[PDB]
């Protein structure tokens, strides 16, 4: 399972 | 021996064009298993490798779900980055990433990591303690204070020790016949004449996997590698992998030189000549 | 970050004209992400053709592969065009039997 992007 | 996962994600801005195009590739080791791409008809989370159909309907729909929110984040940082940089609302740009861990055969971490690059550099990066971040430029700094006002190392941190080593686990015990198979190299020779009595020798190693693999040529048992020219290893599509190393030498010395042929999946190393 | 793209062309098996294989196109070491790969039968456009193995290198150069099933004849060829900003005009490598 690919982990959970926030923004930069 | 040792696993990995890992996620390719890329987010590109086409002005003119409409929404930035977003991805999102999975692997396990050298193999493909899951990948999104927003340029479908109907973007959906889709199986790449075989054994992931042992996931129900509810892991593709989290999944999905997980991957759109992240376009969203992305089509977000895009806008920011401009302001970032001051730059042109008119032009195209890249963020790129890569996140994953690692497990030792016993299914412990190893290390885990992600790294972002904007336009094809380096943008900021967590350390391998995965407490804190490290940034390329000042535009990163923002990023990095940003995250650490938000405790976003430690919530990536979680990610990676958890969630990313015990799905991990998980993918290698369903794909086990897969992931931990080894296809052993079948390799072979080819000649090519050149100007001035020099030939060209080619070495092949075919469908072997992993695709971890040392290919050298010799001469009086010493190995030639400043000498030869080489691909990078790559996949045929069929989940295996390939790759030729070749060295030039005098016409009639072709029997001199020897390819080598090293493979998890050789127990003894390769030899042959032309 | 304004790299050129490398084309190579070849099969999963020693061609052996009659028997199935595969011709793959793997373009790599290539930015900006956005590509053209087209592969070809006798100059024609190989219809249902695989996108898979997309990544990137250390330096964040782009690698994509481009698959398609076929069985070699001793006439005809196969090639690979590629479309960049790196480059005026598409790029086409053919297929090498002999390599
Ligand atoms: C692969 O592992 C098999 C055991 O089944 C495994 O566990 C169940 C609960 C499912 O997760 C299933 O997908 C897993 O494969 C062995 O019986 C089999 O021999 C193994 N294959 C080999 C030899 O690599
Ligand atoms: C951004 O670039 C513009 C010109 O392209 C310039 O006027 C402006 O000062 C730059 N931003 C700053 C404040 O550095």
Redo the contacts with the bound molecule.
Sequence with gaps: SAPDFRPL | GPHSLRYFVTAVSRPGLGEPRYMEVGYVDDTEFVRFDSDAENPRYEPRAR?ME?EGPEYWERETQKAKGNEQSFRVDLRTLLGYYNQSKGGSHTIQVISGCEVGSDGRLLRGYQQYAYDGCDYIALNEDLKTWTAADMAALITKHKWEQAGEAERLRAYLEGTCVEWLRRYL??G??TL??TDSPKAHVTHHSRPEDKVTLRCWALGFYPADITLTWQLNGEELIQDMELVETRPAGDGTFQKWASVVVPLGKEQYYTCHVYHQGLPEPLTLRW | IQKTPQIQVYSRHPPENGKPNILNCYVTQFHPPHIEIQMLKNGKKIPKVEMSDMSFSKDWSFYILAHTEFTPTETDTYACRVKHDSMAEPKTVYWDRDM
Excluded: D, S, T
């Design positions: 054994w042992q015990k369903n086990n016949a931990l198979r």
